[PDB]
């Protein structure tokens, strides 16, 4: 709880519960506060495992679930029902970094009593956005993107009021999930907090420059980065993020170009799981969603054109040089 | 993984899934194979946290649960319903080392098709009992107690057929619980398997001797140990256990006498969590279950007379010397 | 190893050998390439432990050692003897940041064949200076200060030609010192390289600003920082350092004034070992060298006036605010 | 120094110094107490790296060295000179487990003043032999064989009088070698001490049974194990070892048989470095000494016939089964 105390302060929270993984954080929150017959509203742009938890597992246990575009004004209140218990989203979301106005989402949820607004703040981190300041009830993180300060280390965090966290710990962790953090990983996360502020800002400043470079490259059809003035919701990101994060996505002309780009990266490394101080790149259609049919990948919001990049803390010149060489080979 | 392969060989399983904790192992097994409208039969002698998962959590998500005494012949088959999906128990069981006939429990469950029999083999360990050999579908462990060589790790293990473990991993761990094992804990556990045979057998050897000493000591009332011919499950234990484990429980004359005894244990140390290669002792009604209403502890088979002793690998004479001095004071 | 390869690329070396400590790196280099009857020339501004190795240990095993001021032009070539095998120095040097011209030092050593020029590049780091580029034979580091992302590791690095590193490993490490790096420390150091550019450059950037603030503050007497035009080695530093490092030293009016200042540092913390991404400060004559006779400290360039400041990566204004408050009290 | 305090108690020593490796322990002891013109007497049966330290490195720095058979009565006093400073040996020694009477070696050294007797107690461990009880001045260990309680962890230990250790730390470690232990490895060694007594005795009991099995196998030409009544010095081992250790060596009929045995081990693993709770096997002529000419390997005491085995803590049935299958294939 030395770790928990530090993270709680970082997220402007009364309390924190550390868990075995980001999925552990999400699960220990949602299972704790739901029951059969309850209703959950989720955004439609979700981390794959979150979507499966909601779409398959919650529903299996009698929980009603709507997936909706939360960036559409009024869409949350439109979907409110007498049994609505949770409103869940990530911002910058899923593969295309869709921005959701946190204050506005909370305002819609507050039309009814006893709705827990839960926000996955993994991508922004406590350094850039603090959803609890904007009326959110619970914030969750995967520690893998920023908080861990190294990697090979998987852990999650839940931050909330003390009475919520008491239940998350005694029920969500100890009874329901068993997603208890390792003492060893907890030590390593705690070590990571020392340079967290600087690492997040470096990666975000690096990403802004990488996004600007990508924005002018002839092989890039589209860039998704909240810090670019032509990103939808750029203004929303500007009001609720101190900087624009280290996650970027971009489209190239087809499957082959995506693969050829990946095949020619050296400084930037290929990875199934993104985040951390190392710059990492993936083609989700073939690397995380290969067993999902083409139509289902697309009907979600994921095409064969899309590349996802988590920008690390390296000298940005080395990152741009790497991407530049690879993208030129695709022309 | 290397760990998963080694444990699978120890349990004669096709496959194994490592988890963040023993609760994570139980949870990733049960939530994966249940849905609202299903039925679960559990033994009525459970480790505290397991009981809470079944009694409160499963039930609020529309699972029907019966808690029954599975040492009563015919009791499992008697409780089978059209919607029964799982039969769950631990043996030897938790407060007073009740022994459940594994082979017979399986035979009862087979009075209906497609029931998963799940056994918590933590206290026996793969060294002493292999429930899969007797037709059990899934075996779970808290790696903390015996598989790990120390008391500094939280981890769990699930062993079963490849197709079951596939679902435990992709759904139970990845979606439902997020109870992923730390690679550092996993490495330590893997090293632990190299001394597992030694630690389990020496502790059990010591425990037979300690149990007999306690059985003959005037201050000790009833001793609960599967290796004693006076223990009701002794004949069952003999057919399914290579040795009788290192857990002992015993009654002394009242709570105050227990406190005096425990105040005089030196080599055997006080602990809220038992297990590990050193001798540990506790009085549950005052040390772990103090928050549970007295009558509820008693209805569940936990009295204020009960001391639980986890026998370690120390010189057995030193262990006996310590207890003899303590117990003599309460004469 | 992976670590050794990354550091070798950073220093433009053929090869690298990781060690248990910075002293281990120095020791495995010097003992390997010396024998009784050899001669070593060292700069007279050394980190305490290095001086002891040279002054007491080498000499008792029949190595002749001269300590000389290597910032005096011609001083190295002047001290060459038929048996000279090694020229050793650090720059910037340890108490007062004396700057030694690396290229010129090499040129002097080349007035005789087969001399190994060895430079401790700890405080500059591979980010700011690459001594090998200037003809140095061997570069050593304490990985503790900058390469590692925290203050929790002891490790060293040696970078040189493959054939030299072959001997450093097989003799210096394996036979002479046994100063082998921990694989856990090595892994952490490897992860540290991902933020090394960021941490070194931000600290140096901050340090230029801090140095200028101190230079203008009335309570501060002489400031020792390579980036100040008033520092004698400034022009040399400009040609061999991309930035001027994050170590500063400065005089205040007497020991008692230093103690009062240090009693009032809050954001900048007191420390006996400097380096790392947080601002640290010390008064060597009372904090680290208290056991050394006063006159001996002074003969070696350490006075009771001297404060050493290792500038970290915090907001520079916060660092300046802290020092200003402390220094104003001694006006 | 929590670790150091524990190890000191275990070796019956005033004090202990932890180091980066076994070679670090040896080096920090010998370099600290020698100077040019001093003389060291070593046994002729040494760990390869120790031999090189003495034969090449000490001599390079003006230290006179004799290698002698210390199992020959009177041989130490025979080689005493006015400048003799150190008498060094291991028991059970080198590849063939030669036993050296510790008390007798000390008695010969005590014929002259100020001789430090140093014994490498790695193979026996503090559980089986405590040389300091027999008048030895300094005991050294590699932590890799027993003390570490896991492996992948390299560390050394020096145990002695407080005034000797003070010099070993301030000079041997801090000035001369830099062989400083990692905080992380020190934690892991400390963890290992908990089960050290049981692990050593298990491995020794296992080895006795393995040696007895090997002693009757038709493919084994000779066995070297101190616990066999036909081992030279069996009686010496019996008086100075509580049990006979976990190291065994044996001869098979030629290079091909040695390799064929190695090629057919499964439970026992091939390794360059022996020791620890895993059973490990090697053919030193091809695995550690392949670059050493046949004649030099033999003139030492190492043939193509020799296999070295470190017996772990596994079920001894599994170990014997593994070796039995492999040895039968060589008939």
Q: What angle do CA D122, D124, D125 make, to 5 degrees?
A: 65
Which residues precede gaps in chain D, with C-N > 2.5 A?
A: none
> Please, are residues A125 and A200 in contact by the beta-carbon 8 Å criterion?
yes
Interchain contact B183–A (C-beta under 8 A): yes
Exposed, middle or buried: residue C162 (CB in 10 Å: 0-12, 13-18, 19+)? exposed
Q: Which residue of D has its CA nearest to C188?
A: D184
How far is Cα B105 from Cα B206, in angstroms, rounded to an integer?
A: 29
- CA-wise closest residue to C200 among C312, C99, C317, C319: C312
Which residue, chain included where needed, has tokens 């919607």? B83
Q: Which residues of B touch D277 (CB under 8 A)?
A: 191, 194-195
How far is Cα B60 from Cα A38, in angstroms, rounded to an integer?
A: 11
How far is Cα B320 from Cα C12, in angstroms, rounded to an integer?
A: 66
Structure tokens at C204: 């140096």
Q: Which residues of A touch B27 (CB under 8 A)?
A: 176-178
How far is Cα B281 from Cα B122, in angstroms, rounded to an integer?
A: 18
How far is Cα A259 from Cα A215, in angstroms, rounded to an integer?
A: 19
- CA-wise closest residue to A275 among A123, A98, A96: A123
Query: CA of B154: how far to CAs of A191, B20, B129, B146, in Å?
Result: 20, 6, 22, 11
> Please, are residues D20 and C24 in contact by the beta-carbon 8 Å criterion?
yes
- CA-wise closest residue to B269 among B327, B310, B215: B310
How far is Cα B223 from Cα D20, in angstroms, rounded to an integer?
A: 49
Q: Tell me, what DSSP letter sits at residue D4? A: H
Written out in words, the top-level CATH class of the domain with range C1-196 is alpha beta
Q: What is the DSSP string of D174-229?
A: IIII--BPPHHHHHHHHHHGGGHHHHHHHHHHHHHHHHHHHHH-TT-SEEE-TTST
Structure tokens at D172: 């041997």
Helix (H) or strand (E) holding B49: helix B48-52
How far is Cα D72 from Cα B184, in angstroms, rounded to an integer?
A: 49
Closest Cβ–Cβ partner in B35, B52, B182 for A184: B182
Establish whether chain A is in contact with chain D, requiring a minimum of 3 CB pairs below 8 angstroms: no
Q: How far is A236 from chain C (nearest CA, A)?
A: 27
Structure tokens at C153: 């590791």
| C232 φ/ψ sector (left φ>0, alpha ψ -120 to 50, else beta) | alpha
> Please, are residues C288 and C272 in contact by the beta-carbon 8 Å criterion?
yes
Residues facing residue C86 across a β-bridge? C40, C116
- CA-wise closest residue to D207 among D271, D123, D142, D328: D123
Query: Could you tell me how many residues make up chain D?
Result: 331
Q: How big is chain B by its Cα radius of gyration, in Å? A: 19
Q: How far is B140 from chain A (nearest CA, A)?
A: 13
Interface test with D, best of B146, B149, B202 (most D CBs within 10 A): B149
Q: How big is chain D by its Cα radius of gyration, in Å? A: 19
- CA-wise closest residue to A10 among A152, A137, A141, A173: A141
Q: Tell me, what DSSP letter sits at residue D233? A: T
Q: Which residue of B has its CA nearest to D150?
A: B191
Helix (H) or strand (E) holding D270: strand D269-270
Buried b (16+ CB within 10 A) or exposed e, C190-224: bbbbbbbbbbbbbbbbbbbbbbebbbebebbebbb
Q: Tell me, what DSSP letter sits at residue C280? A: E
SS3 state at C10: helix
Q: Which residues contact A184 (CB under 8 A, 6 or more apart)?
A: B182, B184, B185
Helix (H) or strand (E) holding B59: helix B59-60
SS3 state at D146: coil
First vs last C-alpha separation in chain C = 53
Exposed, middle or buried: residue A289 (CB in 10 Å: 0-12, 13-18, 19+)? middle
CB contact under 8 A, D22 and C52: no
Q: How many CB atoms lie within 10 A of CB D248?
A: 25
Task: Residue window 53-72, chain C: list those with CB within 8 Å of chain D.
Answer: 53, 56-57, 60-63
CB contact under 8 A, B178 and A171: no
> Please, are residues A65 and A55 in contact by the beta-carbon 8 Å criterion?
yes
Interchain contact C17–D (C-beta under 8 A): no
Structure tokens at C161: 């030609």
Computed from CA positions of residues B201, B204, B210, B216, in that sequence, does the dihedral angle turn out positive or negative? negative
Half-sphere exposure at residue D250, Cβ-oriented, CA atoms within 13 angstroms? 30
Closest Cβ–Cβ partner in B25, B49, B176 for A27: B176
- CA-wise closest residue to D182 among C247, A223, C18, C47: C18
How do the domains of chain C map onto residue ranges? 1-196, 197-331
Q: Tell me, what DSSP letter sits at residue A63? A: -
Q: Before B266, cis peptide (omega within 30)?
A: no
CB contact under 8 A, A314 and C191: no
SS3 state at C292: coil
Method: X-ray
Computed from CA positions of residues C130, C131, C135, C137, in that sequence, does the dihedral angle turn out positive or negative? negative
Residues facing residue B156 across a β-bridge? B19, B142
Residues facing residue D88 across a β-bridge? D42, D118
Q: Which residues of B touch A21 (CB under 8 A)?
A: 20, 178-180
Q: Which residues contact D37 (CB under 8 A, 6 or more apart)?
A: D62, D63, D64, D83
How far is Cα C42 from Cα C55, in angstroms, rounded to an integer?
A: 10
> Please, are residues D17 and D158 in contact by the beta-carbon 8 Å criterion?
yes
CATH topology of domain B197-331: 3.90.1150
Structure tokens at A307: 């590349």
Q: Before B33, cis peptide (omega within 30)?
A: no
CB contact under 8 A, D177 and C176: yes
> Please, are residues B90 and B119 in contact by the beta-carbon 8 Å criterion?
yes
CB contact under 8 A, A35 and B61: yes
CB pairs under 8 A between A and C: 38
Query: Phi, psi at residue D133, to the nearest 5°?
Result: -65, -25
Q: Which residues contact B75 (CB under 8 A, 6 or more apart)?
A: B68, B69, B108
Q: How far is A59 from chain C (nearest CA, A)?
A: 41
How far is Cα B88 from Cα B90, in angstroms, rounded to an integer?
A: 7
How far is Cα D189 from Cα D148, in angstroms, rounded to an integer?
A: 4
Interchain contact B2–D (C-beta under 8 A): no
Q: What is the DSSP string of B221-278?
A: --EE-TTSTTSTTHHHHHHH-SS--SEEEEE-SSHHHHHHHHHT-SSSEE-SS--SSS
Helix segments in chain C, DSSP class H: 2-11, 22-30, 48-52, 59-60, 75-78, 102-109, 125-128, 162-167, 183-216, 234-240, 255-263, 284-287, 294-299, 316-328
Helix (H) or strand (E) holding D60: helix D59-60
Interface test with D, best of C176, C188, C273, C292 (most D CBs within 10 A): C176
Interface test with D, best of B185, B194, B315 (most D CBs within 10 A): B194
**Resolution (Å units):** 2.5
Q: Tell me, what DSSP letter sits at residue C180? A: B
Pairing of strands A15-19, A156-160: antiparallel
Which residue, chain included where needed, has tokens 């032999």? D129
Query: Phi, psi at residue C31, to the nearest 5°?
Result: -65, -35
- CA-wise closest residue to D301 among D241, D227, D262, D249: D249
CB contact under 8 A, C149 and A151: no
How far is Cα D56 from Cα D64, in angstroms, rounded to an integer?
A: 11
CB contact under 8 A, A195 and C152: no
How far is Cα B310 from Cα B305, in angstroms, rounded to an integer?
A: 17
Residues facing residue B139 across a β-bridge? B119, B159
CB contact under 8 A, A312 and C194: yes
Structure tokens at B59: 């039930």
Exposed, middle or buried: residue D239 (CB in 10 Å: 0-12, 13-18, 19+)? exposed
How far is Cα A71 from Cα A58, in angstroms, rounded to an integer?
A: 23
Structure tokens at A311: 């920008």
Q: Which residues of D touch C19 (CB under 8 A)?
A: 178
How far is Cα B298 from Cα A249, in angstroms, rounded to an integer?
A: 60
Computed from CA positions of residues B235, B239, B240, B242, in that sequence, does the dihedral angle turn out positive or negative? positive
SS3 state at C24: helix
Closest Cβ–Cβ partner in C191, C199, C278 for A150: C191
> Please, are residues C283 and C258 in contact by the beta-carbon 8 Å criterion?
yes
- CA-wise closest residue to B44 among B3, B76, B6: B76
CB contact under 8 A, D180 and C19: no
Half-sphere exposure at residue D189, Cβ-oriented, CA atoms within 13 angstroms? 29
Structure tokens at C85: 């095998």
Task: Please give the distance of CA A43 from its chain centroid, rounded to a whole number.
Answer: 12
Half-sphere exposure at residue D11, Cβ-oriented, CA atoms within 13 angstroms? 32
Q: Which residues contact D112 (CB under 8 A, 6 or more apart)?
A: D80, D84
Q: Which residues of D touch B278 (CB under 8 A)?
A: 194
Interchain contact A218–B (C-beta under 8 A): no
What beta strand segments (E) does chain A contain?
15-19, 39-43, 64-68, 84-90, 116-120, 138-142, 156-160, 222-224, 247-251, 269-270, 280-282, 306-310
> Please, are residues A92 and A47 in contact by the beta-carbon 8 Å criterion?
no
Structure tokens at C242: 């991309």
Touching subunits of B (3+ CB pairs, under 8 Å) are A, D
> Please, are residues B18 and B1 in contact by the beta-carbon 8 Å criterion?
yes
Interchain contact D275–B (C-beta under 8 A): no
- CA-wise closest residue to C181 among C18, C1, C17: C18
CB pairs under 8 A between B and D: 38
Task: Please give the distance of CA A246 from its chain centroid, rounded to a whole number.
Answer: 11
Q: What is the DSSP string of C38-97?
A: -EEEEES---HHHHHIIIIIIHHTT-EEEEE-TTSTTHHHHT--TTEEEEEEESS-TTT-
CB contact under 8 A, A20 and B178: yes
Helix (H) or strand (E) holding B68: strand B64-68
Interface test with B, best of D194, D275, D276 (most B CBs within 10 A): D194
Q: What is the DSSP string of B134-189?
A: GT-SEEEEETTTTTSSSSS---EEEEE-HHHHHHIIIIIIIIII--BPPHHHHHHH
Touching subunits of C (3+ CB pairs, under 8 Å) are A, D
Closest Cβ–Cβ partner in A36, A49, A152 for B174: A49
CB contact under 8 A, A180 and B53: no
Q: Which residues of B touch D314 (CB under 8 A)?
A: 194, 197
How far is Cα C250 from Cα C153, in angstroms, rounded to an integer?
A: 28
Half-sphere exposure at residue D23, Cβ-oriented, CA atoms within 13 angstroms? 28
Q: Which residues of A touch C198 (CB under 8 A)?
A: 198-199, 202, 313
Q: What is the DSSP string of A124-174?
A: THHHH--GGGGT-SEEEEETTTTTTSSSS---EEEEE-HHHHHHIIIIIII
Q: How far is D199 from chain B (nearest CA, A)?
A: 8
Interface test with B, best of D202, D279, D310, D316 (most B CBs within 10 A): D202
As separate numbers, helices (DSSP H) first and strands (DSSP E) second, chain B gives 14, 12
> Please, are residues A119 and A70 in contact by the beta-carbon 8 Å criterion?
no
Task: Residue window 137-176, chain B: list those with CB within 8 Å of chain D.
Answer: 149-150, 152
Touching subunits of D (3+ CB pairs, under 8 Å) are B, C
How far is Cα C290 from Cα C272, in angstroms, rounded to an integer?
A: 12
CB contact under 8 A, A52 and B175: yes
CB contact under 8 A, D195 and B195: yes
């Amino acid at each position: 709880s030395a770790l928990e105390g530090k993270i709680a302060k970082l997220e402007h929270a009364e309390a924190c519960a550390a868990t075995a993984s980001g999925m552990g954080a999400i699960a220990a929150s949602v299972w704790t506060f739901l029951k059969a017959g309850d209703h959950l509203i989720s955004d439609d742009c979700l981390y794959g495992c979150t979507h499966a938890l909601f779409e398959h597992q919650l529903r299996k246990f009698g929980v009603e679930v709507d997936f909706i575009d939360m960036a559409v004004p009024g869409n949350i209140e439109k979907h409110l029902k007498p049994n609505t218990r949770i409103v869940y989203f990530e911002t910058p979301a899923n593969p295309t970094l869709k921005v959701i106005d946190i204050e506005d989402a909370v305002k819609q949820a507050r039309k009814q009593k006893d709705i827990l607004v839960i926000v996955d703040n993994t991508f922004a981190s406590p350094i850039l956005t603090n959803p609890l300041d904007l009326g959110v009830d619970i914030v969750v993180h995967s520690a893998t993107k920023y908080i861990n300060g190294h990697t090979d280390v998987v852990a999650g965090l839940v931050c909330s009021r003390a009475d919520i966290i008491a239940k998350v710990k005694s029920q969500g962790i100890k009874d329901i999930t068993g997603a208890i953090i390792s003492p060893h990983d907890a030590w390593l996360i705690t070590r990571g907090t020392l340079t967290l502020d600087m690492r997040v800002k470096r990666a975000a400043e690096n990403a802004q420059k990488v996004a600007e470079f990508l924005h002018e490259h002839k092989a890039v059809k589209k860039v998704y980065y909240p810090g670019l003035p032509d990103h939808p919701g750029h203004e929303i990101a500007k009001k609720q993020m101190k900087m624009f994060g280290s996650m970027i996505a971009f489209d190239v002309d087809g499957l082959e170009k995506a693969k050829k780009v990946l095949d020619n990266c050296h400084v930037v490394s290929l990875a199934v799981s993104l985040g951390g101080p190392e710059s990492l790149i993936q083609h989700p259609a073939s690397m995380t969603h290969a067993g999902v049919p083409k139509e289902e990948r697309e009907a979600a919001g994921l095409t064969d054109n899309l590349i996802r990049l988590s920008v690390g803390c390296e000298n940005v010149q080395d990152i741009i040089d790497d991407l530049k060489q690879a993208l030129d080979l695709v022309l």
